[PDB]
From Swiss-Prot, chain B:
GO terms for molecular function: monooxygenase activity. This is Monooxygenase nsrQ. It comes from Aspergillus novofumigatus (strain IBT 16806). Keywords: Monooxygenase, Oxidoreductase. Pathway: Secondary metabolite biosynthesis. Belongs to the avfA family. It is an enzyme of class 1 (oxidoreductase).
Length: 149, 144
């Protein structure tokens, strides 16, 4: 129900904040009550709060250097306040080269200046080797995040 | 630009034909030059032509009974003539229960009454168990 030009500006700011690869710069575009869901539902990963996200992303971005974002497809449904992005990522990690692809569904808030809900499906076969190394990493350094992956 | 209502009718006919309610079926809504892409790109699967799909669907259909389609999200970008669907499927197969989830990206043709190309990302971890069973079934029975 937010204006389309307001939604489109948030969509671009969301992409630029993601490509900038800073926690504050990316989380600028998320509302205070934004949740993240990992798809598929069969994976059984619980919803992540904004507080979970604020702990996970600094760990993520400190371990992924030379981050590169390739935007492949953007689909914006302004009357519904929804958008979809298919993107490809790459980076260097202590665990070796990182390669991922994302299908990200977004919901804008009523004002349209923030993202209120995120559902994300990614390269699950490749990530079933990388994400557990992240969790083992967090445990070995006693970083006690209260959130996994 | 293709009208949003024309595109929406194709979107609904695509979903209804996928669920099996439409007459003329799933493939009547695709252009003659429609292709299907298996996401992610890292999987290295070449595009499936319309002829490949017409060969492939009778094999899946024969192996799948009680097919059920659950639509979770539809995102329609009428200005660009694009749409995204997130759906959940289930069926009974000779290999046991089938469970899949789909993130399907759709491009409509210029007029808007047909699907011009498809890019699909599915439950890859679960499909790594199911898809090679299909190839073994095809090979064991000397198909194609």
């Amino acid at each position: 129900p937010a204006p389309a030009e307001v939604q489109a500006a948030t969509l671009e700011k969301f992409i630029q904040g993601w490509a900038g690869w800073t926690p504050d710069g990316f989380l600028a575009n998320w509302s205070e009550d934004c949740t993240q869901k990992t798809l598929p539902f069969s994976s059984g990963v619980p919803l992540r709060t904004r507080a979970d996200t604020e702990k996970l992303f600094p760990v993520l971005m400190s371990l992924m250097s030379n981050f590169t974002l390739d935007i492949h497809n953007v689909v914006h449904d302004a009357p519904q306040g929804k958008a979809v992005i298919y993107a490809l990522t790459k980076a260097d990690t202590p665990f070796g080269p990182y390669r991922n692809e994302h299908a990200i569904f977004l919901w804008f808030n009523e004002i349209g200046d923030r993202v209120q809900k995120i559902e994300e499906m990614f390269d699950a076969v490749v990530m079933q080797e990388f994400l557990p190394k992240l969790d083992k990493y967090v445990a070995d350094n006693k970083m006690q995040l209260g959130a996994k992956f």
